[PDB]
Amino acid sequence: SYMLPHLHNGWQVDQAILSEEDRVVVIRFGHDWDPTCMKMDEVLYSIAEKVKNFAVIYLVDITEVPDFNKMYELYDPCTVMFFFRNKHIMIDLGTGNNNKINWAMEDKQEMVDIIETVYRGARKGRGLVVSPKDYSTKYRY
């Protein structure tokens, strides 16, 4: 499956980041073999037709284009990062850093809310968007 077209070329991915400016660009640097990236792709497909009018999500393979995993240092098996009009917005997840999500978010509503908040912060220009979630914990009990 993986209906989201993965930008094979690194320069193609960079141009795609420079392609759209009025919406949210999310790149899934996870390798499609691992099950975690499969769950991330499933979550994206859940929000494929929802956040489409406000965002443009693309997949990525760190093996295909390695420059993204060597310059941005995306060492996680499946890290979700955002870039808005040549500005990598930071989501205030609270996991020590804000460059990636790094978690296999199995909740479609949580992903949709995060996308909406990221879009609102990008519109407001805040480079560090306050994520409306307590991602610092496992959020399970």
Partner: peptide, 13 residues
């Protein structure tokens, strides 16, 4: 299109 990528991913898993 997506068929080739899906087949490639399946063949490695």
């Amino acid at each position: 299109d997506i068929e080739s990528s899906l087949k490639q991913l399946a063949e490695r898993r």
